[PDB]
Design a protein around this ligand. Structure first.
Ligand SMILES: C[C@@H](O)CP(=O)(O)O
Ligand SMILES: C[C@@H](O)CP(=O)(O)O
Ligand SMILES: [Fe+3]
Ligand SMILES: [Fe+3]
Ligand SMILES: [Fe+3]
Lengths: 174, 186, 162, 190
């Protein structure tokens, strides 16, 4: 395995160490080499550092000058059909490796059966969620309406009336 | 008179291995502790080695009903943005909550185009994601090399913007008014 | 200055207006973030022995702890450093705390310390820490520090943080 | 053992895929058992990471087994890492690790011996990102630090005294007397 040397000796700095205190690890020119993940994990144990930290910032950014652009129907797109019933049409919006917590989706609602924000781009949307004391709460969101949802709140979005196809923008973040 | 949550103030004192008995000149009921002016509250802040803000952290009542906040179209704040004498945006707040003050969701009407001069913002510390709902949108942002970058987003396209990146959204076609959804978050 | 920065996040200015906090959908605490002046002397705060808060802890009529604040700063209200004198041993009954939301690390500066805590399955776990030994404790873990020998008063440093 | 293979927690990976409305089937070239998903080298894992628009570090987040025993970790004197510190041909510190846990890698607790004094030239550090608090357990400690606008400030800390240090503030601890060797406790965190 290959690890960014400048980053590794930055991690070693937090433990008041250098490349010296690593047992037989080949290195030269801003690169440190481990023979196997089990080897790196043993180094991870020794430094009392989780394995994930050794890759932090090692992935090349997918941004173009601090910006990433996605196109309609450009990324992942899927249909959700369970039991012959057409429910959703999933589509990824712009996703970046600079914020894995960010998940943006465009949803075409067809059927009548992390923090999150949801905006209704078209049609009437029927929203359910479990309030406190396990009370079944429901409401109808129309075009222009938006909703904020606290983490760990059971909720579902569907088409209000049926026949008419609705569309929402769902953003999950941190 | 200044009020501070009793349970929260006791929790603060608990960490410092203190109780309300270790605070002087303080009135209190079951829910709150009372101070004689902010000058009194400043002395106590000094005594506990604590910023004045900590007395009110988590003491704001939630605006969710419940765990959920719903906004209606044109239900919130709304204004026009004029930069350098140029009509640029038409801000409309989406749903806002005090459970996440770092979240700013907006619907914008673009009014400027290529026949108007460029008016970049200073950017913001908020991560931003923008979705185009209508029309064609010209986006310009300042790259790493201090140089200007540009692109065009059509209906359905989206863009992610790193914090503190100066940017501008205008109409690709002069005259035609486009619409976007701008979501700022932590 | 700070208010105009808070208003800027809502795309507002001073002439668009503590019910204000409710209207701006902003917690009351955020309007004070940064108002208190730093107590640091050029990025540093120094505290002397027996200078700050000092208290004796007597639980159930038995002398257990002697709390003494180390350096405290308004630049980190989550930091709580204490020097403790241990006065109780195992001939006096065991009295655990309720734990706390802060991560904690303790260092034995003198003597021998008997540490008890509630681990898995609500089981009472025990061990002994000598001078130079240390212990990390997860948040909300009920624990207790007493003398191992008894009479031989020990001393520890306990740091609480984020 | 196969050194080329990279193992990833199956439940964790599936959780990541679930957020992006995906299942394991949308990844073709992967073997897996009940507990883990296997990749043919780091080259393969980087392809899947880019496709998922997910940084390489996220595949291992929360997957490290805890070194705690019953929510507690105990260290002994001379039981862990121990190192000498010479900065400019000048013997300065003797680093000794206190208890270190992977449940808080930002927590670096040290017991230090002071070897330098007024006879030796000053050797400040460049400061660090971690907040720090120091407690004097023995001797008299001379502390120097770079204040605001690059002014040199000094003070003396005796047994029982403490000091808080803001992140990225250059500092140095030496023996006040000169000859007598002092001891301190340094706690770096978040
Ligand atoms: C200082 C700490 O470790 C013991 P307690 O004061 O929380 O009971
Ligand atoms: C005690 C501590 O300040 C030494 P260093 O952090 O400069 O290495
Ligand atoms: Fe903006
Ligand atoms: Fe404690
Ligand atoms: Fe330091």
């Amino acid at each position: 395995l290959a690890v960014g040397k400048a980053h590794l000796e930055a991690l070693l700095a937090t433990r008041k160490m250098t490349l010296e205190h690593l047992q037989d690890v080949r290195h030269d020119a801003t690169q440190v080499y481990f023979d196997g993940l089990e080897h790196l994990q043993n180094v991870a144990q020794y430094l009392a550092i989780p394995l994930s930290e050794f890759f932090v910032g090692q992935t090349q950014s997918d941004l173009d000058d601090g910006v990433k652009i996605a196109r309609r129907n450009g990324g992942f797109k899927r249909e959700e059909i369970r039991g012959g019933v057409h429910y959703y049409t999933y589509e990824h919006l712009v996703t970046t490796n600079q914020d894995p917590g960010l998940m943006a989706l465009r949803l075409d609602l067809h059927s009548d059966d992390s923090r999150e924000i949801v905006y209704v781009t078209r049609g009437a949307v029927r929203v359910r969620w479990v309030g406190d004391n396990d009370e079944l709460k429901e409401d109808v969101l129309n075009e222009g309406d938006s909703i904020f949802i606290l983490p760990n709140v059971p909720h579902s979005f569907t088409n209000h009336v049926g026949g008419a196809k609705s569309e929402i923008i769902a953003i999950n973040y941190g």
